[PDB]
Every structure is written in C-alpha cells, then in structure tokens.
Amino acid sequence: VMEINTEGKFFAYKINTFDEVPFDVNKFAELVTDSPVISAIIDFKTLK
Amino acid sequence: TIDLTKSMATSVMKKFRKSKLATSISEMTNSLSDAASSANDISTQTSTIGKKLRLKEMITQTEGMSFDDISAAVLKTKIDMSTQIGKNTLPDIVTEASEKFIPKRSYRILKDDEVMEINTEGKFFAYKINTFDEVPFDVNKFAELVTDSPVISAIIDFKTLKNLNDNYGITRTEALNLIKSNPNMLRNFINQNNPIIRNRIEQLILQCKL
Amino acid sequence: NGQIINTYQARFGTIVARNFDTIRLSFQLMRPPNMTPAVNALFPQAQPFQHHATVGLTLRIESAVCESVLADANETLLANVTAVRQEYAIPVGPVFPPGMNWTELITNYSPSREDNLQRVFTVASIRSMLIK
Amino acid sequence: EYIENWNLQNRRQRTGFVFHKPNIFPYSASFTLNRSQPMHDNLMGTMWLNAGSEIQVAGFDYSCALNAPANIQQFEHIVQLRRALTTATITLLPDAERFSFPRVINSADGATTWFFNPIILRPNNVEVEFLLNGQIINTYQARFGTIVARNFDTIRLSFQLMRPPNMTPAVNALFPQAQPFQHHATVGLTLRIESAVCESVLADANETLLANVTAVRQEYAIPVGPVFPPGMNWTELITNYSPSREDNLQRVFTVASIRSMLIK
Amino acid sequence: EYIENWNLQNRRQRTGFVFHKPNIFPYSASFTLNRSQPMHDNLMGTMWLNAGSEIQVAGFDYSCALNAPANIQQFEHIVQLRRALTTATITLLPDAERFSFPRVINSADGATTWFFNPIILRPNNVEVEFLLNGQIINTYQARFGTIVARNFDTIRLSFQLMRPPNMTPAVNALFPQAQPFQHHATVGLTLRIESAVCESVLADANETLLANVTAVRQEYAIPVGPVFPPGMNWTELITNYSPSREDNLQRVFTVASIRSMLIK
Amino acid sequence: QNYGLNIPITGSMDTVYSNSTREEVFLTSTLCLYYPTEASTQISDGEWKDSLSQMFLIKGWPTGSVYFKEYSNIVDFSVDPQLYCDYNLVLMKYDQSLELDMSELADLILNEWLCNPMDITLYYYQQSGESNKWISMGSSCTVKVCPLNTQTLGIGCQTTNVDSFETVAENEKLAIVDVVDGINHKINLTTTTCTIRNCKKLGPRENVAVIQVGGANILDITADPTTNPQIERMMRVNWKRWWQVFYTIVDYINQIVQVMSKRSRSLNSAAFYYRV
Amino acid sequence: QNYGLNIPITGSMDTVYSNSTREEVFLTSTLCLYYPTEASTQISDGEWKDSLSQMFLIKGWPTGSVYFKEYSNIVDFSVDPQLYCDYNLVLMKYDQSLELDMSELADLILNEWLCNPMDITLYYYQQSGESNKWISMGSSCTVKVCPLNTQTLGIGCQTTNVDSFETVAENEKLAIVDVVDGINHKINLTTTTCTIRNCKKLGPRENVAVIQVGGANILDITADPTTNPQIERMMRVNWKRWWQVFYTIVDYINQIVQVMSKRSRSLNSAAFYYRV
Amino acid sequence: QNYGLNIPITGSMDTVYSNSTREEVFLTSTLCLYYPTEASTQISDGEWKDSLSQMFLIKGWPTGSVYFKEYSNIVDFSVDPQLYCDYNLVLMKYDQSLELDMSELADLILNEWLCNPMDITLYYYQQSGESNKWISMGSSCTVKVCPLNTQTLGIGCQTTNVDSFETVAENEKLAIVDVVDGINHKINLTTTTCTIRNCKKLGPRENVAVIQVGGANILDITADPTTNPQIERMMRVNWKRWWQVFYTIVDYINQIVQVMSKRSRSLNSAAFYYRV
C-alpha cells in the first residue's frame, strides 16, 4: 500500500504486516493515474 | 467570455430532448409499457438487439468505458478547442454528437466463463473468457439474457482481443478486465503504448468524425 | 562493407551477386530529344504539368545463400514457430518482438535475436520431420 | 580475459569484456538547426560532441521559447551505439560544459559564421531512455548522479527548455520580446559511460591493446591493408564496424594481449 | 608488476609499468604573452595548464589576427616530459574548457591585473607532434579524438587562430578593427593521456602507492630527507626527477606495493 | 529544392570554412545610397555622382553597381519608402523635433513589415499582440481612434461624434500608431489623402542601414519603451561637411556592407514563405 | 542559411502521420474581392459591403478578414495591379474586344514575375528565352520596337528614324510584349507616360484567382500558341445580376480557397518582384 | 518569521519553477502614474481618467487599483516627491537646461535614501564616503559650503563671511550636493525655506520606474563620473502625442511591471532593517 498525505509526507507498507518499505516515486506516479485511489480516514500512523 | 450566458445548459437540453436518441428511448419505454399493458435471421435479430442495446447504454449507468463516454470526451475536446460557437451551435451539435459519434459499436454479456458479443452491424460471436476461442452461439439465450444481465460496452472488441492475446500474451486478470472494459487496465495498456490498443482507440476517435 | 563487389549496367533479366550487403540502384530520366505531337502535348514547358514522367526498376532476389537464418517462401519454419507461440499465447519475452513480427524482427536483428531465431528454427525443423 | 573470451567465443557461448571508459562513440562534434536564417540571428536546435565515453549535448534557443507552445521548447538527441553495451554504469549531469561558453561556428554550408552566446537555463523533465532493438530497456526521468543501464544499443536523451515564468529584472532584461537577442538560452546534458560490458572488443582508457597494435603497425611501415583504416584511426574503424573488421580486430587484440603479457 | 620490473632493472633489461592516467605532467598553470602593453588592452599569447594527465592550452589574440600576416596567427606549445612514455593512448579534443570563460589574471609579476574575455574560435590546421630526442616519432594533423603516441618525451602542439573571412553581422560586431577589442578571440586544445606504458615509476589514478608512501611519512612526522621534497609533493618531485630520486622512488614504491599486498 | 518546409540541417564543426566573399558581394550586388537634397546643395557640384562612382570603382564596386537617390527631406521620404535596390544606405540628417519621425522611418525601413489593408469606414480594428501596429502613410494622416467597450460603445468618444475621438497623430506623413492591444477601435482618417495598413513586424530587414548624420542615439525602432536596442545597422556619424561624410562612407564601405546582409526575403531559398 | 532545401524530406505511404506544424504570423487570412464599379452601380445599395461581410461570417471568415476593392474597368485596373491582400479574387466582367487585355492582366497576376528596369534611351535589349517578356505599364504605352542586325543596323526599320519602327502595342495601359529571343532591339515609347520592365516569369502565383463573370472561355495566360492550359484558378460564371454573382461566390467560397493556396504571398503588394 | 537576523538560506539548483505570478501582481498591487500637467492640457478631454482606467482593466488591472497624479513640472515636483504607492511610474518630458534637475530627481527617487537631519547653525558636517550626499529641498535652495582645515579654519573661505563662502548650488528646488570626503564643512543654506538632510545611499528602489518622454539618454543616477550606467528602470520613448505615449504605457504595462518589482523595504521581510 502506497499512502500520501496532502502535505507531502508519504509512506509505503505491506498489508498483512504493516512494516513500511521505501517509497517508490515514478511507480506511484504511474499507478495513481489509473488505479482506484482510496481515502485514508485511518491514517497509516494510527493504523500501525 | 460571453455576455448572454442565458442558461446554455437549458438551451442545449431543449434541442437535446427532441433528438433521435431521446425520442428513441421514449419509444422503447413506451413499447415495453405497451407490452406489459397488452394481454440472415440471426443477423437481423442481432442488429435489432444492438440498436436496443445502444439505447440501453445511453439510458443506464455502466461501469465499462461506455462508447458514449468516448463520444462525450471527444465532443468536449472539440467544443473547447473550437472558437466558433454561437447561440444555436451547442444546441444542435450536442445532439449530433449524441447521434452520429461512433455509429457502429458492440456489446458483451458475460456468463459463466463464457462471453456473448453482439454488433449493431450484425456480427455476433461467443467465446470463452479464460482462453479466447469462440464457441457456438445461442441467439435465444442471448435475447433472454440481454434484458436482465448487465451489458459491457465492447470498446476493445473480440476482433481486437484475439489479435492482442495471441500476439501479446496477456494474463488472466488483465484479459478479464479488458473484457469487462475496466478503465484501469485500458489506461494501463495505453500507458504501455502497445500498437493494437493504440490503433483501435484511434479508430474509434476517427469514427467520431461526424 | 563499402566496396563494390559486382556492378552491372543496362543489364536486365537474371544476374548474380557474389557476396553483397548493400544494393545501389542508380538510374536516369532523360527527356526524349525527338517528340511525337502526342508526347509534345504531354510535356509542356509551363508549370501546369498534368502528367508526370517516371522511370522505375523492379528487382527480385529469387534465391541466395545467407550465413544467418531468414524466412523464405519455400520453408515453413517461421510459420511453425509463430503458430506454436500463438496457439498457447506465450507472454512476450525479452528478445523476440510481439507475435514474431518478422518485419520488426528483421529490422532489428541483433546477434542475440539471431541466435534465438536460429535455435527456434532448427527446433521447428526437427519437429517438422515428424509432425505436419 | 582476452583468451578466455577467445575460447568462449570459439565455442559458441556468450562472451564479455569489462571496459572502463569505453570509447564506444566515434568522435563527432556537430549541430542541427531546426530553425535558421541567413543572418543567423534567431536560431534554435541542438549541438553535441560524442567522443570517447562522453555524450555532451546542448539544446539552444535564441528566443528562449518565446513563441513555443506553453513556452516549452523540446529537444531530442539519438545516439546509436555501433555495438550493444551491458551493465553500463553511467554518470549523468546537467549543464553540458563544452557548449557553455561563447563561440562562433562556421555555418552548415561553410559560407558564413554565426555567433553563439549561451546563457544556461536548467534542463527540465529530462528523460534518458536506453533502448535495445527499439524497446525501452530503461528510463530515467530527472534522475542525475550515477545510473545503470542493464543492456542497451541506443540512447535517446530528451530535454526541454522552459521559459522561466517568473523573472528578476536582470533576467527579464536578458530575455526580450524583440528581435536582437543579445543572449541565447541553452540547456545541456553530459553522459559519461564510466564502465560497461560488451561482446565485441573495443578500445579503453584502461587497456593498451589498441595503442600496442597501432604502434607495432607504425613501427615497420606496414602498408595500408584492406579492412583496417589507414593508420588504425579508431574513429573510422568504429564508425563502420563490419563483421570482418570485428573478427580481425579481435584477433589482433588477442595477440596484442598475448604479447603484452611479456613485452612492456 | 613492480617486483618483476625490480628484478628486470637489477639485471639490466627493459622494464615497464602500465599506467592508467599517469601524473607525468608537473602541475603548472601559466601564460606567456607574445604581445602586451602596460594598459593590457591588446594582448596575444598562450595560456596553459599541465596537470596530472591533462594538458589544456589556449592561444588568444585580442585583435583576432588583423595586423598579423594572412589573418592567421600561429600558436605553439611545448610540453617536455621528464620521462618518455610508450604506446600512450591520448584523447585530443578542441576548445580547452578552463580557458574559455572570462577571468581577471594577475600580470607577469603581480603588479596589476588584466581582463580576459574569450570568444572561442575553432583551432584550424592543428598539428600535434610527438617527439623523441627531437626526432618526430608521430604526427597528427587535424585528427581529434583518440590517437596513439608510439614513443615520445615531448609534445609539440601547433595550432592556429584564423580570422573568419566571411562573418555574419553578430561576429563582425564582435571583432572590430579599431582599438577597444571588447571581445578576445581564443582557440584551445585539450589532451588527456588516457593510458600509457612508462619505463620508470610514476603515480597513477589506478594505484595508491604514492598515497601509501606519503601517508606513512606523514603518520610519524619523518624529518625531511635529502632527496624527496617536503611532504613528497608530487609536483616538486616530478619537476626535478634526478636519477637518485628516481631510484629511491622506485624502492619505496615497490615496498609500498609489497605492503599493500596485505595491509589495505 | 524543398521550398516552404522547415527542414533541419546538420553541420559539423571540424569543417574548414571557405574563403572570403567580399569580391562576390561587390562584383554582383548593387550598392544604393539615399541622401537628402541639402547634401548636393552644399556640395555645389554635379560631376560628383560620377566622381563618387569612380572612387567606389577604386574600392571595388563595378561602375554600374553603385546608384544614388535623392529626397527632399526625411518627412517627405517617409511616405511609401520602397528601396527597390540591392544594398541600401540611408543618410539621415538629425534635427530637433524630428526625433519621432526619424524613429518611425528607421523602424519602417529596418524591419520587414508584412501587412493587410484596412477599411476604416466599415470594420472595427483590433491589435493582436506586441508585434502589430497600424502604419498610416499620406500627405496628411490625421488618425482619430475611438476605443470601444465590449458592447461596441465608445468611451471618451461617441461613435457618431468625430470630435470627441482621441487623436494619436496629426498631419503626419508617416505614423506608426500603436493602440492598447486587446480592444476594438473605430478609426477615422481622411480616406482621400492617407492610406492605413494593419501591419505586423517580421524579422529584421538586414539589407538597409541608416547613417544618422547628426547627434545622439535617439532612434528607438522597438515601440516597446522598456527595450532600447542598438542594432548594428543604425550607424551614427558626426558631420560638418557632406564631402567628408561621403568620403567616410566610401572609405568604410566594406565595413558597412559587412554590417548589412543580403535580404532574406529576396533569396530564392525563402520562396514559399514570404518571398519578395 | 536555407529552409533545408538541399536535403530530401521522406514520407511513408503506409502510415498516416499525426503531428502538424502550427504556424501563423497573422490575425487570420483575408479573403479579398476586386469588383468592377458597374457591380456597385447596378446593386444601387451601400450597406452591401456590410451585408457581404455578414454572409462571409456565416461561411467562416471573421469580420475583419474579408475586404472589398472597387476598380473602374479592367483596362484601367491593369496598370500596376497592386494586390494588397491575401486570398485575392478578381471579378473580370467579360466584354468583347477586351479579350487580349483580360488575358494579359490574367497572365500578369496569376503568375509571379521578376522584373528589372529597362533604361530604354541608352542600351539595346534582347530576351533570354521563353520565360522573358517586357511588361509596359502606364497611362498610355505605345511600344515601337526595331530589331537590329549583327552590325547594329536595323532590319525593316532605320535605327535613326522612329516612324519606320514596327509598333507592337498601341496605347495600352498594360502590355506584355514578346519579341524574338536573340535579336537586339531599339525601343521607343513615350517615357513620361509609360514604363517598361524586363520581366522573367517565375512559377505561377498560386494565390490570386480570376473569376470571369461573363461569357466564353478566352483566357490564355501562356503566350505560347500551342499550349493553353486551363488552371483551376480560371473560374467562370454566367451572370445577369451582380447580386446573384456575389451570392454564388459567397456560397462557394470554401471551394475557391481550396483551389487557391495562400502559402505564396509577398511582403509588398506589387504584382511583380523588382530586382533593380 | 525571524526578522532582523541575516540567516543564510539554502536552495537546490535542480528544483522546478512555479506558476506565473502575473495574475497576482495585476490583481493585488496598485499601479500609479505621475505625468506633467501639459499631458492633460494636450489631451483636452476629461473622462480620459475613466478611459485609461478601463483600458488598464482590459489589460488586467481592477478599476480601483490604478491611480493618476498630475504634477506641475519636474522642478516643482522634485521638492520632496512622496511616492506613497505600490508600483510607481514617473513620466518626464525632457527639456533643455533641465538635464541636471531631471537627473537629480531620478537619482532621488530611483534609490532608497536614509536621511538624517543637519543642524546647519550648530555643527560642522562631513561625508563618510562615496555613498553619502546632502539633499537640499525647498522653494529656493542656495547652498554655500565652506570647507575647513584640520584646525577649523576655512580654506578658500572665511568661517565668518558668507560672501567668502563658495556656492555649490543656487536657487533650485532639489540639490543633491556632494563634496570632498573627509573634510569638515560649514554650510549656509537659507534655513527658512530650504531644509537639508545628510543622506546615505542604500540599495536601489525598484518600486519606481522613470520614463523620459523626450530626448536622448542623459540620466546619470550614479554621481561618480566614471560609471554612467543604463538601468532597466530608466526607460526612454519618443513622442509627438501624449495620447500615443499613454497608449504605449497601457499596452506595455506588463513589461514595465516586469522591469520593476515590489519595494524591498515595503515587505515584512525587511521589517527590522529599514522598513518603510
């Protein structure tokens, strides 16, 4: 899961075990054009 | 820039309500209500079903790319770039963009690992969804199923799936989503910039010529 | 490799090319000195030019010998390879182009592509000895 | 390494030579003008030097993209390697330093000479595409520093000259709306193939084989032969690299290494 | 290699070390003015920088060869290697970078400072000669890019500044015929010894022997000995490279190699 | 020959540029001097055109290639100045109060204006952008511009009332009028006398030089006020004797021709763009 | 330098290209009618220019584009035809006995020309080839030519006496005289009222077009007798009423401009390039 | 917001630009125009304020955001010119013998001046360096300076005799006088009608731009004889009609504002240095 705040901060993290991974811009930029984005009412920080 | 701006939306709608598409959907609804209040043959039947399906596409809310969607996008682009738009132009051109954009199109009904595709011209195929190899068609089953099951606007029709799957080997997920006309995978393929999809999309945009 | 191996002048019909990598076809359009009334009417000295003169050549490589492998009109190796890939819908791999498109494949014919092509062609040759 | 490649090539198996600063590009300094006049007062195009392992390309615009669409001029530069490279470590920097000082350049015809007075804008949305058989093997967008190309046969460097939207009075004075254009905008790139791996033998900044072969040819006044150019000019040897030349070059380089193993 | 050459020298024979980018050149950035005035308005001469394996030269004329005969100004630069190289692959390019941007340079004795404002012409009919004891061992006339020097101890670069006969209005305005000379024509050459083979021992970029030796001498604050200069400054060491100094340098370098075999 | 196409051309930098061409641009082209009548009035001669021709021959130009033209004064020369002639010099004496006329003429004859007619009586004319002006030429060009609202109603002026219009040139022989680019205007200009053309500014005319014979750097070819460029061909020379001026021109004719250039629009290579 | 004339542009017959080079130095192209004054006289109106512009607004020309130009009659308009304008149409009302004058004006405007002046009173002149002519224009041209032997002695005409000279054009506003290519000539005409120029014919001007409003097809731009090509721009109509003519032109204006092509235009408005 | 301190910023040379701020500078600032009364005199109209305002609105400046301020003339406007405004433009009709007065005014307004008082009657004054001047302003300034020895005895003047004093400026509204630096001076200046201030030269005042409507480049803002530069904010334009001048201003107002910039000392950034 690649997550973005509207104020710059960004994260990337697995689903089964929320261990964050290095972010991949130029992959996120390509994905977000097409993929179904999801609002993050439960932020990654609070979720972890 | 314009001083009039006297509800161009309403002005467009006024002449839009009288277009052939509007009166055609009205006649379809009237015919179904009358049926309720009452009491090559295959190619001709499928042509009639295709006309009805075009009306249904206009009426309903489909999750596919929905040819009318491309027609509206091309209309918006042409309207925006063109710099000659009088009071009586957007009326009587939005109608035409509804009528003549993409005169020929095709639709799909997905069913239990198979797919049944129809064309307004008269063409009709049926093929397995996992491996694209056509199977015998059943017009009676198709006419039964078309009234109830949802219709997938075949933006990327089987003529193109066969070529694309055979040459560019596709995975089950991407193939299924292209069959479902998923914008996610369609835009993914255009981002990949493969010639088959590029050619077909350009063919549709050309078909929007009016 | 840049040096002329064979050269022919005003020779038509069948000819030979010993070992050649390029073909230079030079020809000329000479305005005919003497002109019958009809051709004089055809070719004026003013701009309009309703009729456009042309001179052309046709050249068929009937047969040859190539160190590397190519498709032909007598051998079905490329057809067998492409059909085997198409029937099963193989994902496009690193080396060959999509669908064994011969035009792109011969346009870009790097040695890795050549080696893979030779391998699959000889395998198809082996297969054709038993399956047809 | 050289005899190992010789045997791994005698038996048909993949071979590989590791090269530090491989002079893969033949020397070529030139320029393309996509817009020009006899006065050479409003030019626009690219200039480039490809030499050794350096590509150094600078796109220039005299009007600073005054009338380009969205004030963004677009520049492309192709470089077709004569032989494929593998596992290339590359160094990509902006601001091509060669084409970054005033010049006067003889015209394309050779008749007149035109004045070039660069002011270096930043190159924006640069894309470096490493191609093999026309298929993009790698792409790097605005990623400078060291980069890697796993396998590639051609290089497409695309960059852009975007007019500065906001401008200090000084830079506004630099870029006028009129004709004179006493300064000409420029944006450049530099690409250094630090190391690579290749099948066919090449010359290097780390190996002495090319120089040794050329020296032993020059020593005894060997007459100019069929395949090798006169004097073993490496630019002319690499500009067209026929298979006969490749075979002969591998042979002479192998013998050169065999000899250099004893004679220094 | 080092111990092999040590044996080959102890039993007098042909030694040799392969060097990537040798520091054959003592560091020297300087300039000679073949025409000057106290006003320093009209100058003509050559600037140069010799450093490591790099030479840059730039012959400049403030009048752009007007009063000169034939509108062609000759420039010549001599670089005298302290040791003769062999089979040296040498890159040779035009347009010396470091002497192609404006500068203010102290005068011959520091009394004043003069302004230099280059406009880079193309060096025409360049001619690079590689000399051994005065005999032309190699010559290259207008052939940039990679070249080879068979065996040489002096480099003689002879280039020229030709005023462009045909000139567009811009360059014509750049080069007047009156006194002011607000732009100063310049033609430059760059020359890198990419690799070579030296009979004696020198510092490199591939090796770290000089680093190890000087680090050892600096760790313990060894007092300055007779032959090596203070701190083993390589420039001062190579400017005067007498035989005893060379012998001591070879001994310490081979010992440093023996150490670096184990201690890294 | 691929006329009418922007086709990129690749040129190397190792190529040795060719030999001089002054002898060609003298033995072929035609030098062409435009001077005011007061010059000849002060010279007080009439073999002097022949004498200047002989001196030009000594300097290189063949006999028939150097041609002279007179004009009463700058303001009268301003009306329809067409220099049908291969290498043009315009001696231009400077006097006070003619600064704007000098600037207008310099702009007109130094920059290539391409332009279309204007029916003042019928249309409302709007200026596109920075490079568009209206040039009015005649014996008495009294241009009265009345701007128009977005509703085509006048402001400061009444479309039926010529008097309240805003004059921007009175009885000028030549007037390069520049209005607020973006607004429709209704013009009135004396159609029997002065013609007006909606003109816009292509690249420079590199075939015509202007020798200001008098004072300071007052020419402003660029109507923009921010930029005051000093073009190479706007030369300036002091004067106290027309013989000395002409001798300077004759002596340095090589330099003046080097500053100038062959007209781009006259070349065959510009055939299908705007060749003229 | 050039526009890349000396290298070839390649194109694929198997691929439809997509990108186009958007270029414009203009507001927008300008249709432009040249009508005879009898047209307005028969119309007997005077908001008709407004009406026609409004029609062209429907057909797809903005207001400021279409321009209108009255001319008295074709013989008068022939003298120095200044086509000050972009998409030029000339409505030539045919009448008998004006066949040659109509055809000669058509030859002048439909074709590009490159003209030098002819100092008649001093030298003798030849014609280089099929492409050369002499265009004589002015109030009243009366050309009288006298061919000359190799000894510079006239044949059929004494070179001193002018009455013996062979007249070739008698009191024409415009004349395009062709003489025998290779014969030195002495020419006499009324230098005050007429000016003659030695004009080569370049390729055709693909910008102007000629609509013959009246009867039979008689245009012959090519002075050759053998060839009489009918270019697409020699349009013709049958008329009784000028309003009907103008409505025809308006309704079919898109086809007319499709026949024409604006890429051939000159900076100045002259119907012939002038090269001293 | 960490005012006062000089902290070193840091920035990357690879970041990208941002969206243009033209919209903001039109929609938030206030344009401000000073012109001489002869302008309105020649205009002879009087809804021209509204006309110019609406033209400015078409260019993009809201109606209430453009101010006009007539001033009598250069000499009487230079007496304490207060530019309490946001984007200042000062037109100046150049005239003979007002070269120094115009240059003094330009130097006064185009640079930020830090002025302390000067009690002439009590202290003896000095100039710290080249960046220090004495600006005298009033109805009639006649500065008479008497330099002094190191022992407070005059040289070339007696400390008690205003006759012996040396006159440096006489009866002008504005006098930016410089004297030798490091020599004490005793002043006499008519204190009832001409104040004097000891002023220091800070950076340039970008807020205001000067437009010389008349002659040639003369404005030497730098009192140093050596450097006589040409600043971007010192614009020049030729003229015959004030309407044409103002239309040029309105047309190129975006370029003029690009030349200018917001005052460095009007911002909170400059809060605790010399904010004004």
Ligand SMILES: *[C@@H]1O[C@H](CO)[C@@H](O)[C@H](O)[C@H]1NC(C)=O
């Ligand atoms: C150029 O000039 C030189 C001498 O200045 C002469 O030797 C050479 O032949 C000339 N070349 C041409 C092409 O005219």
Ligand SMILES: *[C@@H]1O[C@H](CO)[C@@H](O)[C@H](O)[C@H]1NC(C)=O
């Ligand atoms: C300009 O105004 C005058 C009034 O003095 C009028 O007679 C003339 O017709 C006007 N010009 C045009 C072209 O209508």
Ligand SMILES: *[C@@H]1O[C@H](CO)[C@@H](O)[C@H](O)[C@H]1NC(C)=O
């Ligand atoms: C786009 O234009 C270029 C010329 O710059 C041309 O080479 C190319 O073919 C054009 N595009 C396509 C798809 O052909």
Ligand SMILES: *[C@@H]1O[C@H](CO)[C@@H](O)[C@H](O)[C@H]1NC(C)=O
């Ligand atoms: C034409 O001939 C007449 C009579 O001989 C003569 O008066 C006239 O001058 C001639 N034309 C010219 C231009 O000389």
Ligand SMILES: *[C@@H]1O[C@H](CO)[C@@H](O)[C@H](O)[C@H]1NC(C)=O
């Ligand atoms: C910048 O301007 C462009 C169009 O000029 C607009 O599409 C974009 O949204 C603007 N940027 C932002 C951050 O809104």
Ligand SMILES: *[C@@H]1O[C@H](CO)[C@@H](O)[C@H](O)[C@H]1NC(C)=O
């Ligand atoms: C200046 O001199 C006048 C006499 O001319 C004298 O009356 C006046 O007091 C002096 N000013 C000052 C400030 O002392």
Ligand SMILES: [Ca+2]
């Ligand atoms: Ca004027």
Ligand SMILES: [Ca+2]
């Ligand atoms: Ca008014």
Ligand SMILES: [Ca+2]
């Ligand atoms: Ca304007």
Ligand SMILES: [Ca+2]
């Ligand atoms: Ca200006």
Ligand SMILES: [Ca+2]
């Ligand atoms: Ca006639």
Ligand SMILES: [Ca+2]
């Ligand atoms: Ca006779």
Ligand SMILES: [Ca+2]
């Ligand atoms: Ca003839």
Ligand SMILES: [Ca+2]
């Ligand atoms: Ca004919």
Ligand SMILES: [Ca+2]
């Ligand atoms: Ca005194």
Ligand SMILES: [Ca+2]
């Ligand atoms: Ca004053």
